[PDB]
Amino acid sequence: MLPHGLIVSCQALPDEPLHSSFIMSKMALAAYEGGAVGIRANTKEDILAIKETVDLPVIGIVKRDYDHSDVFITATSKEVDELIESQCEVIALDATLQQRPKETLDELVSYIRTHAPNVEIMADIATVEEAKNAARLGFDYIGTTLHGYTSYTQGQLLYQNDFQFLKDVLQSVDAKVIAEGNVITPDMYKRVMDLGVHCSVVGGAITRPKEITKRFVQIMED
Amino acid sequence: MLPHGLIVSCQALPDEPLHSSFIMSKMALAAYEGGAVGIRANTKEDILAIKETVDLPVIGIVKRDYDHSDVFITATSKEVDELIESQCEVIALDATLQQRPKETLDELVSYIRTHAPNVEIMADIATVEEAKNAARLGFDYIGTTLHGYTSYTQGQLLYQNDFQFLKDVLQSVDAKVIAEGNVITPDMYKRVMDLGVHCSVVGGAITRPKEITKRFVQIMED
Ligand SMILES: CC(=O)N[C@H](C=O)[C@@H](O)[C@H](O)CCOP(=O)(O)O
Ligand SMILES: CC(=O)N[C@H](C=O)[C@@H](O)[C@H](O)CCOP(=O)(O)O
Ligand SMILES: [Cl-]
Ligand SMILES: [Cl-]
Numbered sequence: 001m002l003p004h005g006l007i008v009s010c011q012a013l014p015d016e017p018l019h020s021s022f023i024m025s026k027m028a029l030a031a032y033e034g035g036a037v038g039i040r041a042n043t044k045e046d047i048l049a050i051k052e053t054v055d056l057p058v059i060g061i062v063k064r065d066y067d068h069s070d071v072f073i074t075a076t077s078k079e080v081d082e083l084i085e086s087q088c089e090v091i092a093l094d095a096t097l098q099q100r101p102k103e104t105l106d107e108l109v110s111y112i113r114t115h116a117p118n119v120e121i122m123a124d125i126a127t128v129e130e131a132k133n134a135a136r137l138g139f140d141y142i143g144t145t146l147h148g149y150t151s152y153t154q155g156q157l158l159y160q161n162d163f164q165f166l167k168d169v170l171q172s173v174d175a176k177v178i179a180e181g182n183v184i185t186p187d188m189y190k191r192v193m194d195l196g197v198h199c200s201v202v203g204g205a206i207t208r209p210k211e212i213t214k215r216f217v218q219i220m221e222d
Numbered sequence: 223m224l225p226h227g228l229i230v231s232c233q234a235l236p237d238e239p240l241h242s243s244f245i246m247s248k249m250a251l252a253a254y255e256g257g258a259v260g261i262r263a264n265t266k267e268d269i270l271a272i273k274e275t276v277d278l279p280v281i282g283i284v285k286r287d288y289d290h291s292d293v294f295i296t297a298t299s300k301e302v303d304e305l306i307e308s309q310c311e312v313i314a315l316d317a318t319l320q321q322r323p324k325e326t327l328d329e330l331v332s333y334i335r336t337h338a339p340n341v342e343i344m345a346d347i348a349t350v351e352e353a354k355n356a357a358r359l360g361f362d363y364i365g366t367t368l369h370g371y372t373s374y375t376q377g378q379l380l381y382q383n384d385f386q387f388l389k390d391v392l393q394s395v396d397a398k399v400i401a402e403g404n405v406i407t408p409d410m411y412k413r414v415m416d417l418g419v420h421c422s423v424v425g426g427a428i429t430r431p432k433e434i435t436k437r438f439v440q441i442m443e444d
Pocket of ligand 3 (some may be wrong): 123
């Protein structure tokens, strides 16, 4: 199981500067050496490289676009099978009720419980009711990952109104909740932990130097 | 000349997770894409890789330890020659009063003006008196890089007492001053820029995920 504490997301998609299984493995080692308790990573190859450099538990996803679906975080059994092969300890998937290319969310949850019974699952959700649906499906973890990143949560950011959305998720489910998405600073990390999340996933604030650089530059441009 | 704004230090020494000319070239790309106006980098190998990735001006150093000297930032003509070969726009060196392994600081300054007349020079100093000595030697930039990092500045950090050390440096010299050392947040970057530095160097806050991870973990340990 994931400990309490800091999960570092070590992702770099094609065309991002640090894109490379190798580099993500080194970002993960850096996170490990700074006191991270887990890693979140994207694609079987990045996960396998990371698992060569750290024994931290990994939350695995496959970001892959499908025609006629806005679901891209572990959309189908093809991505699930890649992640089972990766041996990541936790499989994260979009747990919205948006249209998927193939299996439904219920079918992907059954698929994972049948084919990878020792793997934990994590629901990336955007709304309280998606969170409650995930809790009902027996998700091990419910993350705020997609809050602000679906067509229907545009402009919503986890931290808004002192983490009201996070407070509402924590109030609505007994499952382990993960503060993920727009945890930008140590102060935000402390706040989500004090609000009672099991753990927090921090990505861009640690592993996206372009995004960190932009925050430094923006302070001069207000 | 270096513009006003943010210089990103893209360094990873041999024991650090990201040690690699290729990775530091990508950190530099990320800095560029985020709005940096320059790069500080270490070793000819890293500098050449960065200079083929971005056209941003580079402050080059070679960190290399010598016996019977505490000077490790561009200590001798050997490091200077590596930086001349690198074609970096600015050569930075330890510009402390500390005894060097070979040439004196004064000797090295003469050497650079002779052997690389088109290169600007940056004085990494620890004290106001070293800043004044650097102005004496005609340095183009005076950075606060070694303030707190010498045997005679123990316990001091750039930000202490609302950047009093930086205020004292800026009052002491007419040369372009660079805020470097422990500039860890956008707030600190804003502050040193508002105090009148030419530019600021931010390293670990952007390019050392281990260091950033430690600050996240640390807020849960206070
Ligand atoms: C919507 C989406 O794709 N999210 C990604 C999912 O893996 C990453 O953003 C991940 O959550 C990283 C943590 O977010 P941040 O960079 O700290 O804001
Ligand atoms: C004393 C020393 O070795 N300094 C290094 C000089 O290259 C780095 O610290 C460099 O100044 C980068 C700025 O420091 P930070 O990583 O932003 O805190
Ligand atoms: Cl980046
Ligand atoms: Cl690091």
